[PDB]
From a paper:
Here, we present three high-resolution X-ray crystallographic structures for distinct macromolecular assemblies of the capsid (Cap) protein from the beak and feather disease virus (BFDV), a circovirus infecting critically endangered parrots. These complexes include a 10 nm assembly, resolved at 2.0 Å and comprised of two face-to-face pentamers of the Cap molecules, and two 17 nm assemblies comprised of 60 Cap monomers in the absence and presence of ssDNA, determined to 2.5 and 2.3 Å resolution respectively in the same space group, arranged as 12 pentamers. Each Cap monomer was comprised of a canonical viral jelly roll built of two, four-stranded antiparallel β-sheets, with sheet one comprised of β-strands B, I, D, G, and the other sheet comprised of β-strands C, H, E, F.
The crystal structure of the second assembly identified in electron micrographs and infected tissue was resolved to 2.3 Å and comprised of sixty capsid molecules arranged as twelve pentamers. To determine the precise mechanism of DNA binding, we co-crystallized the BFDV-Cap protein in the presence of ssDNA labelled with AlexaFluor488 and AlexaFluor647. Crystals diffracting to 2.3 Å formed in the presence of labelled DNA were highly fluorescent, and displayed clear positive difference density corresponding to ssDNA. The capsid-DNA complex, modelled and refined to an R-factor/Free R-factor (R-work/Rfree) of 0.173 and 0.197, respectively, revealed an extensive array of electrostatic interactions with each ssDNA chain interacting with residues T49, R51, K102, L103, K105, K163, L165, Y234, Q236 of one Cap chain, K154, K155 of an adjacent chain within the pentamer, and F42, and R46 of an adjacent, inter-pentamer chain. That each ssDNA chain spans three Cap monomers, both within and across pentameric protomers is consistent with the increased stability observed in our assays. These DNA-binding residues are highly conserved in BFDV genomes. In total, 180 nucleotides are modelled on the interior surface of the capsid, and cryoEM data suggests that the remaining unmodelled ssDNA would occupy the interior of the virus capsid assembly, thus shielding the positively charged ARM domains. We found that in the presence of ssDNA, 60-mer particles were highly favoured with 10-mer complexes almost non-existent in electron micrographs. Once Cap is localized to the nucleus, the presence of the ssDNA viral genome favours the 60-mer assembly since the strong positively charged repulsive forces are neutralized by binding the ssDNA viral genome. Interestingly, the overall positive charge of the N-terminal Cap molecules in the 60-mer assembly (+1,960) is almost exactly equal to the ssDNA charge of the viral genome (∼2 kb ssDNA genome), creating a neutral and comparatively stable particle.
Residue numbers in the entry:
A (entry chain E), B (entry chain B), C (entry chain B), D (entry chain E), E (entry chain D): 42 to 247
Write the structure that this text describes.
Amino acid sequence: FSTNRIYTLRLTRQFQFKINKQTTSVGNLIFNADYITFALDDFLQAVPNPHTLNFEDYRIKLAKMEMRPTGGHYTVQSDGFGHTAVIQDSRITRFKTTADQTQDPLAPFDGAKKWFVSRGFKRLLRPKPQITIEDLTTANQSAALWLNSARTGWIPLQGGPNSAGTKVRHYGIAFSFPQPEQTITYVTKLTLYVQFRQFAPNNPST
Amino acid sequence: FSTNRIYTLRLTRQFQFKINKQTTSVGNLIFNADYITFALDDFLQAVPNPHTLNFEDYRIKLAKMEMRPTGGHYTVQSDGFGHTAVIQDSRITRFKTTADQTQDPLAPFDGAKKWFVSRGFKRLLRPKPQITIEDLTTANQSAALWLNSARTGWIPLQGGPNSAGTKVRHYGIAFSFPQPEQTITYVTKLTLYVQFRQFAPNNPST
Amino acid sequence: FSTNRIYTLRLTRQFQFKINKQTTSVGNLIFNADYITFALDDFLQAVPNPHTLNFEDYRIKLAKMEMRPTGGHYTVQSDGFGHTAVIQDSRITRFKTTADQTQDPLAPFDGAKKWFVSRGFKRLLRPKPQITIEDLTTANQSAALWLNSARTGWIPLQGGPNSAGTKVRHYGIAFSFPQPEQTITYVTKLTLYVQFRQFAPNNPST
Amino acid sequence: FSTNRIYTLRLTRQFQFKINKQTTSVGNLIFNADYITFALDDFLQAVPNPHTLNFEDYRIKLAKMEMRPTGGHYTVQSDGFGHTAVIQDSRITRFKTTADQTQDPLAPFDGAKKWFVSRGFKRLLRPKPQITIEDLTTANQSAALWLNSARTGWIPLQGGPNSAGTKVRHYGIAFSFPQPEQTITYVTKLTLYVQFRQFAPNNPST
Amino acid sequence: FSTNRIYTLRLTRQFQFKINKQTTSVGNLIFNADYITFALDDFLQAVPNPHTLNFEDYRIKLAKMEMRPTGGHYTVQSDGFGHTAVIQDSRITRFKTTADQTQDPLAPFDGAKKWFVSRGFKRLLRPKPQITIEDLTTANQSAALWLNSARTGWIPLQGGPNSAGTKVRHYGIAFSFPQPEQTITYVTKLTLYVQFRQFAPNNPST
């Protein structure tokens, strides 16, 4: 029971996702995309999970996204295929498309993987937190760097001036789809595999 | 970082394809066919791809065509089977049929593979560029020759009197189908596996 | 062609540098110094280079500075010797001297290497990006940290709140010189050896 | 003494090259470039060489370019450095620059090699003839392909409708330079290492 | 971290040296000479160096003298050769000549190494501090002794009645030259390789 004692937990949450009936450029093949990021706090705030944890540090070793259709949609009713892509930096925010795309916006990525609209998909990834760099050739701008291995660093749950360690955004997975003729609803389940370091007391009473 | 340094990229593009409801020779079995060819420029002009590449030469090692039904078509709704065939010369243009065929026009080909209309198909091939021969027994006519191995040659991206190296047409895959009782729409994804030779600057400023 | 697929490119740019005739403390030995830093954007904006790259992340493995005399300067015309030094943090900005130095301001550095003014120099180094630390004993001040191995991290090209990943400043090489009796002009060539991670599409259309 | 009997010859020619005094943008670093291509006829027409050869076919295994200063220019008078690049397709014609370049136009090439203006350079290469492709996605345009190995093909000296086999253009080497303060004249020597197949008679008398 | 803990540093300083145009005994060969000694304080006083060191003892293991021409002097311009000699006692003071020598005053020394006036020289040596002997056959006179190995002793930085440990003079290197037809200026760089013993606090406050 040393300072560096480690514990591993599995954490999950779910939510609904909708792909809307195509009402634009009807008759043409169009694509759109959305994305998911992972933060420990997103999971601790889910109703059935522990809302606080008594550990000093954490690191996310692995994340999982599974999206499967519901609402009575037929798995044998083909609606083409889109792609999933692992995008481990804040550029992923551009891949929630705000206009219709004439090509699959994710297919060109290295690591892009096909998925069929009518079956959903399942994918695991190593999501990355973004370390700050403030020394750029343009003054007062900043950029990011992330570490190749999760074993390199630890994130204090209550470190920093806001005690907001659990809100670090880890990137990330995006998914694209050809727009279908009818609306399709899905159940999405996210899973975190998180290591925690150092069991810790509550903050002192004041 | 020598003159002969090689890089390899994967490139993709997508489009919609329709097989129309049978409205001719109704009640009888008929077949039609279409085809696809591959040019690097086709892929670089696709919206999400780089539209120019800073390499001196290229060669297409492998191509992949995948066509899958969309528009709510049921995979368990059987509409017979047609064939794909690898046709590596410009004769393939005759296999976009302009009249109904009473037999499957591609089935006799060596290499012809069956595919079910309601499931689509996936096929990889080695598409071939066509070298010119102008010395024929008939005057003012030319013919073609293609090389067995992609490693034999290189196509300069900006070589030739038109600087149109990326537009060389590589042949090719055709697909046939028995005409269905209802229209079927598909999503088609093409993929190229391309080697590039010699990282290169932009053309000099003028 | 996985998420972690790596590509390696060599990139270069050039510019002119002048060491001015000595017009101060005439007859005495004085020294001055200047310095160079490395940012990917510096090289992509150079006219003959690709101005955007379709990769998700990068890291600079190695940099090279070569400065050689031009303008008819005689290599056999001895004008003494100064030093180069590898300075891998923003302290290097103090070594663009604004006053004449009575000693060589770089010679004391560990790693300082001699170079003859009339011949120029060539030096390779591992330039370092600067990670931010904001938790200091003095309020409202920040400091830097850099990683020993380039393999530890990745810089996303479009990551961070400014999408300015390519503008991260990597430090750095400084060079000093005894002031010569006549002006000397040089041609400087910088070279980067950069690994890129994950071929990527263009940003979606908006 | 069979049909496939081979003979190897070394062939050479020389000419003068001038790099002009900079008279534009004086005070700025600018670059220009030129290039050389290789054709057997260029060498057979040189005064001291045999103007016809009694062989049926040939192939160029190796070419060499050596350019060295003359006109009294001092090798110890430094005028910076440019680069040489092997460019084995007709794109090389763009690298005879018609406007001043702000960067070295050849340095980014894979295989680019530095050379000092005041010493000249020497470089060997495998120059390539350009095979015609007329089947492009744009009608009535053509492009090129070249073969990786010289051992793959033979060029008949008198083949084709013009009996102009010796005029096939083999590409190619380009060289760039920073513009110097005074004009520099050079002697350039080119060398071909050519294999010939099948000793042959003169054409019949008519 | 014991009493005997050793640290090793490299220290350097520079200065100008002139060999004057021959204005005496013109038309004849004459020689003059000068010398350098080494004291830690000489290097700590130099502007860019730390002016105090927090160590208890030191010893100089190795010294280096490098003198190279400047002022535009041509290296290919022959001005004869002189010699360097390692003179490890205070007799060296006699070898700053005050009258012209008709022979090279240092060439006879065992260890004398020639150097060309137009190229300068570089020499390493083990400089020696001088231990006092006061028991001589003549009253009120003293002499010197020095130790063969640097490992034999240690010099406390603040030892002795003047706390002037860093001012111990270590001998020494002399250089001779034939008097040239025109003045020649040089840049001289001296380097010390110093071991320090026992990291130490500041002197107590008073």
